Every structure is written in structure tokens, then in C-alpha cells.
């Protein structure tokens with residue numbers, strides 16, 4: 001609640017391996033480039049892959065890695081917070097040490113460390129937490145339990161597991177809507193190019209009582225830009241996919257429809273995936 | 278103590294990254310044991326992100342222990358509801374996922390097993406018991422089976438992708454951490470070949486550096502997807518095809534394996550050197 005005062009705090013949730021981090025970074029870059037917003041990304045994926053395209057290839061040191069190797073007194077803002085494309089601030093929480101420790105404890109510690117270092121600037125326009133939603137356990141769903149960000153967006157695709165993951169995240173949102181003021185702002189579709197995928201999403205959003213903030217199409221220029229360790233925005237701000245991310249970024253920034261979702265049961269979800277084939 | 282469970286059986290945990298066919302291999306290995314060697318086999322799913330028993334139950338989704346426990350109560354959880362019988366009498370149980378925002382996925386697996394034990398759901402005459410465990414992130418939760426001694430004999434499924442080998446190394450780190458405390462050991466690496474290529478040599482060296490061995494090289498074969506499309510294992514779909522014999526060989530090797538080690542996980546440099554020498 002006391003982090004980045006006049007900034008839109010947003011958490012981007014979603015299953016892994018569906019391009020969630022690519023959409024988060026390109027959305028962040030779209031805001032800074034097209035609308036001149038001061039943006040900050042705090043990664044919360046154990047892979048620590050939420051800022052590589054903003055910092056250009058170099059995998060940034062994670063907060064939990066630095067803290068493990070050094071300790072509280074040694075950590076500095078210069079080491080864990082990096083500036084990248086369009087002066088976007090980048091921080092990575094990092095994953096747990098194999099065999100011990102919870103993902104959520106790592107993200108709490110990283111946010112706390114950023115708090116103590118005064119690393120979230122007061123003039124921030126947009127702060128994004130990129131969080132993994134394969135499993136809504138106490139660790140990965142801690143942001144929902146504590147309202148780390150009140151405005152949630154779920155990334156999904158026209159795939160069974162990706163819809164399953166999305167629905168279970170909506171359950172976590174519904175669960176903590178009153179306790180932490182958490183809300184669902186909408187759904188982001190990273191297209192898999194499935195026949196009737198846009199209709200599948202429209203319906204999925206209607207059942208959840210939410211909306212599709214944007215349909216992000218599949219485009220080869222994405223893999224092109226990432227091969228250059230770049231966002232599509234920086235690689236070519238004029239290409240159609242860049243405008244697609246711009247519309248996404250603008251819809252998020254302008255969104256005011258923050259709802260308590262109505263997750264579907266497993267039976268309705270079975271019907272929906274059986275009916276879109 | 279968990280050494281109570283299935284005392285006459287070879288108790289085995291299978292860890293691995295998702296999206297690499299770990300559950301496919303576990304179920305086909307189980308199907309081979311029961312089909313070819315008349316083994317009494319049981320699978321306990323410990324992957325909340327992966328179906329570990331669908332191929333044995335012909336596509337019939339199974340009520341998970343944790344779902345029945347949370348939404349119905351302790352009384353409701355009964356062997357009939359959570360323990361199912363499929364191909365060649367292979368017993369099936371699914372731990373389930375966590376309560377959103379509170380439950381620990383790894384602790385729930387331990388709760389699932391504990392409940393199964395209280396319901397005498399692990400037959401004494403079991404020949405082989407399989408825990409199909411998620412190995413995407415080696416957090417304390419999913420390292421519980423290793424620190425609790427659910428199975429002292431661990432197997433790691435990987436493939437030729439960096440992230441699969443990376444995840445495999447991290448699992449080896451989790452085994453080593455509790456190897457002294459829990460007696461947990463690594464019995465071998467299972468490679469689900471992504472393609473018909475030189476993956477075997479890459480795996481032979483990977484195992485060498487980890488201080489372990491390749492218990493089998495599961496070739497890539499489209500018959501897996503055709504069998505999955507029919508909601509079956511390859512064993513049930515076509516027990517005479519070569520891929521069925523590959524699982525047969527893997528099943529036999531796991532069953533009689535007595536070469537267990539404390540792994541030597543690779544350094545980050547070693548992993549990069551292996552990647553360079555064999556291609557990105």
C-alpha cells in the first residue's frame with residue numbers, strides 16, 4: 001500500500017511458457033515509449049526472466065541471490081536495480097535455493113529490501129510485478145494474499161492448462177477481494193492461433209465476469225526482437241505488433257473496471273474446452 | 278515413518294520439469310511392469326500441474342485427495358473415492374493442488390500420502406510404487422518428499438533442452454542436500470529424447486559429471502502421441518511396438534537398479550561448457 005504512491009501498481013499473473021514475460025516487458029516499454037510514463041518492473045518468476053529484454057541480454061543479479069551471497073548490509077540499489085530501455089527500472093526477486101525456502105518468502109524479502117533501499121521512486125507512473133501462476137500455493141499467490149498490487153491481470157492462451165491456470169488465479173483473486181482489496185482488471189490473450197480463439201476468450205471472460213483487455217497476436221517479429229535481446233517496441237516501434245502492445249498498454253493504463261471475478265467450476269471449464277475443440 | 282509404505286515394493290520418486298513427458302514415461306513404465314512382468318503397481322500423483330494417472334484410467338479424471346479433503350472433510354476421503362484401478366490393475370491416486378493462497382503444494386503431497394497411509398491404501402503386496410513429483414522449481418515444499426524419505430530411490434527425467442538439464446541439476450541439488458539426513462539417493466537419469474539425434478552422448482556426459490548413470494534413453498516416437506490421443510499408454514495401445522520394449526527395458530532397469538549415489542551437481546560454468554560443446 002505504501003509503495004510508489006501515485007503509481008498504478010499492477011501484477012501480471014499467468015502460467016509459464018506462454019509468453020507472459022514478453023507481454024509484460026513489451027507492455028512496459030510501450031508505456032514508456034508511446035506515453036512517456038516512468039515505469040518499473042519487479043520480476044517474481046523463479047526463472048528471473050522478466051527484465052532481460054529491457055536490459056538487453058545481460059541476466060540481472062537477483063535480490064535473493066545477492067542476499068544469499070552477501071547479506072543485508074552489503075546489498076545496494078546499484079546492484080539489484082538496473083536501468084534499461086527508456087529508463088525502465090528493473091529488479092528481479094530470484095528463486096529459492098534448491099531444496100529449501102518458499103518462492104513467496106523470496107518475493108516478500110525482495111520487496112522488503114527494495115522498500116528499505118527506497119528503490120521504488122516516488123514519481124513512478126507504472127510499477128509491474130511479473131508473477132508466476134502455474135500453482136496458486138501460499139508462495140506464488142502471496143501477492144494475492146497480501147495485495148502486493150490491487151490491480152491484477154491474467155495472461156492466458158487458447159490452451160487447456162493456460163485456461164486452467166487463469167481460472168485458478170481468479171479464485172485467488174475472488175478469495176482475497178475483501179481482505180486485501182485485490183481485483184481483476186482483465187485478461188490478456190497471448191494467441192496460440194487456434195480457430196475461434198478470440199471467441200473462446202470473449203466467452204471465458206464473460207463467464208469470469210471480466211473482460212479481454214487485449215488479444216495479443218502471434219507475430220514472428222517477437223522472436224526476431226528477442227534474438228536481439230530487445231523488446232518489439234525498441235526493435236521496431238513502427239511495426240504492427242508494436243501498435244498491438246501499445247493498445248494493450250493504453251487499455252491497462254485507462255482501465256477502471258476492476259471486478260471480483262466469478263471463476264468457473266471444473267464442469268463449465270470442461271464444456272468450454274470441449275466446445276472450442 | 279514413511280518406510281512403512283509398501284515394504285515389499287521398490288518405492289520410487291520421479292522428479293522432472295514439466296512439458297517433457299515425465300508423466301507419460303512414469304505411466305508407461307508402470308504399464309510395462311504390470312503388463313510384461315505381472316507386477317502389482319501403483320502410481321501416486323504428486324504434480325499439481327500434471328495429470329499422472331489419466332493414461333491408466335482411460336481419460337477418466339480422478340478426484341484428488343486434497344480436493345476431497347478440503348471441500349468434503351476428513352471423513353469423506355475414502356479409498357473408494359481417491360484410489361482408482363486402471364490398466365492391468367494399476368492403482369491410482371492424485372495428491373491434488375493447494376488451497377489458493379494458503380496451502381503449500383508440497384506439504385499437500387505429504388498430507389495426501391499421510392491420508393493414504395491412514396486409509397491403508399498402500400497394499401502390502403505392492404511390487405512397485407511411483408510418486409510422480411513436480412520438479413519445475415525445487416522449493417522446500419517439493420523437496421519435502423526428499424527430506425521426509427517418501428522414497429529413498431529418486432529418478433530424474435530430463436531431455437535435450439537447456440532448461441530440462443538445468444532443472445535436472447537443481448533436483449540433483451535437492452537430493453544431495455538431504456541425502457545424509459534422509460538417506461535419499463539418485464538412482465539414475467531418464468532421458469525423454471526430444472528428437473532422433475545425438476542426445477544420448479550429451480546425456481552420457483551429463484550423468485558422468487553428476488556422478489550417476491543414464492537408466493534409459495527413451496527415444497522419440499510418434500506412437501506416444503497416438504496412444505495419448507486414445508487416452509492410453511503405449512503398452513495398452515500397442516504392446517508389440519519398439520517403444521513398448523523401450524519402456525519395458527526402462528521398467529526392468531528401475532526395478533532391479535541397486536546403484537544409488539549422492540549426486541555431484543554441476544557448477545554454472547560446467548553447465549555452460551556442456552551447452553557450448555553440444556550446441557545451444
Ligand code: SF4
Nearest residue numbers: 102137139381416418
Ligand atoms: S507454498 Fe509453494 S513456493 Fe512455497 S514452499 Fe510450498 S510449494 Fe513451494
